[PDB]
From a paper:
Each monomer displays a central α + β fold for the core domain, with a protruding middle region and an extended C-terminal region.
Their structures were found to be nearly identical to the wildtype NfnB, with RMSD values of 0.38 Å for 428 Cα atoms in Y88A and 0.39 Å for 433 Cα atoms in Y88F. In the Y88F structure, the side chains of Phe88 and Arg100 are well ordered, at positions nearly identical to those of the wildtype NfnB. Compared with the wildtype NfnB, the side chain of Arg100 had been displaced by ∼4 Å toward the side chain of Asp97 near the entrance and was found within a ∼3-Å hydrogen-bonding distance from Asp97. Almost identical structural features of Arg100 were characterized in the Y88A mutant. Compared with the wildtype NfnB, the smaller side chain in Y88A and Y88F mutants exhibited a wider opening to the coenzyme FMN. After comparing the efficiency of Y88A and Y88F, we concluded that both enzymes were more efficient than the wildtype NfnB, by about 2.3- and 3.1-fold, toward butralin, and by 11- and 30-fold against pendimethalin, respectively. In particular, Y88F exhibited higher efficiency toward butralin and pendimethalin, with a lower Km value than the wildtype NfnB, but Y88A was more competent than Y88F toward oryzalin and isopropalin, mainly because of its lower Km value.
Numbering used by the authors:
A (entry chain B): 9 to 109, 119 to 231
B (entry chain A): 9 to 111, 118 to 231
Write the structure that this text describes.
């Protein structure tokens, strides 16, 4: 499977089968993903991969947070930018309706069970790391996501876990020197599920690339 | 070429031939790279791709700052974390070893080549709105790595370059970008000189032991 095809076929999967994931395969995938670049070769990404009973523990700890209402929230940072304008948000609303086309509470709690993935990756780093190092983490993460598709697996990046970073970090036994960026649900896609088959929009290049001197 | 092979063969190339880059191919690489994910599908990345005379103007303007010594610096942000400790600090000097081994004064001289994109014919400047936060910066990395892998797949090479953020204001000026924008990084783009010493040394990575923790398996 070519990089183009991997890129094309990678999507945020929100329904996984219970087909087990080969730990050997994941390990091999992480080996190659480490070839992602990073400023100064800092390789600042760190990951705690959980499954089974531990993975169920994280779910329950956060579940406890969730019933606490707005008091249970423990933001690691600002997920949505303060000062998001509505022309930016129309992008999320464009994908937001299509995902669906109150009830919302129900689907969003599925986030916190990783949409049924058997494995959950938690991507974190030292609190000393700055914005370019977070960009390095993105490079690694997208490397992982593409390798998963190539290898017959699927994934869903989830920043929703950062709503409860401290709880997650505590449950993972990570120090308060670490900060949680995102979760990544991992597993085999339910490839007959509707939520996994709608076409996902992107803006046109006219909104992205400016050419000069050509 | 498979995604695994792309990941494996992608390196930070610091010696390019002067074979031009096909504008058409670059355009085709960017529509596919746009399939990168992003929080909320915000797609926060923006890029200004320069070549020829424009790419020469950016070079000259930054060179003017460069001779100003350290009084000329215009950092967009903190490139290296201030107070960077081990294990991390040993990692950059170690790759620093291998990069120069395959080549004070001369050391300095080579580093300044950064500001000519190591001779690359094309330079992409990746930027975004200043409203964007750290998670949006990770979104940009996701996009950038998509581009770098697609290049490799199509026989092109690149060098991501944060060195340009040392003179962000000047670069933004020469590109005509507003101060609502912040420059993250450059990406030098071109055809790799596949006999260059600088391009053939094996690039180290830490073992998974330092990266991955497994729980419940
Ligand atoms: C850093 C990051 C965090 C994300 N967090 C979530 C999340 O918490 N819940 C969710 O449903 N999707 C999440 N996503 C998926 C995005 O909504 C998705 O990538 C975007 O809508 C584009 O859709 P696609 O990836 O299927 O192509 C996240 C994506 C990224 C890159
Ligand atoms: C965001 C970013 C900025 C970078 N900036 C520079 C740079 O300014 N100069 C340079 O020589 N290399 C730069 N690099 C390349 C890294 O040094 C390189 O990725 C690392 O040593 C690993 O080497 P490799 O990518 O060839 O495997 C940058 C990489 C990243 C991700």
């Amino acid at each position: 499977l070519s990089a183009s095809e991997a890129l094309a076929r990678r999507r945020s999967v929100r329904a996984f089968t219970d087909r087990p994931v080969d730990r050997a395969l994941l390990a091999r995938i992480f080996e190659i993903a480490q070839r992602a670049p990073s400023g100064g070769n800092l390789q600042p990404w760190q990951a705690t991969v959980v499954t089974g009973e531990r993975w169920q523990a994280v779910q329950d700890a956060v579940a406890a947070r969730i019933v606490m209402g707005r008091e249970g929230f423990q933001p690691e940072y600002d997920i949505a930018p303060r000062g998001l304008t509505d022309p930016w948000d129309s992008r999320r609303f464009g994908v937001g309706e299509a995902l669906y086309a109150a009830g919302r509470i129900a689907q969003f709690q599925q986030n916190y069970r990783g949409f049924g993935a058997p494995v959950m990756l938690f991507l974190h780093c030292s609190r000393i790391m700055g914005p370019p190092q977070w960009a390095d983490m993105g490079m690694w993460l997208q490397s992982v996501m593409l390798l998963l598709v190539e290898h017959g697996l699927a994934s869903c990046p989830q920043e929703c876990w950062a709503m409860y970073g401290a709880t997650v970090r505590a449950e993972l036994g990570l120090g308060d020197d670490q900060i949680l960026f995102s979760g990544l649900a991992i597993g085999h896609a339910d490839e007959e599920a509707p939520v996994n088959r709608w076409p996902v929009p992107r803006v046109g290049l006219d909104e992205v690339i400016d050419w000069q001197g050509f």
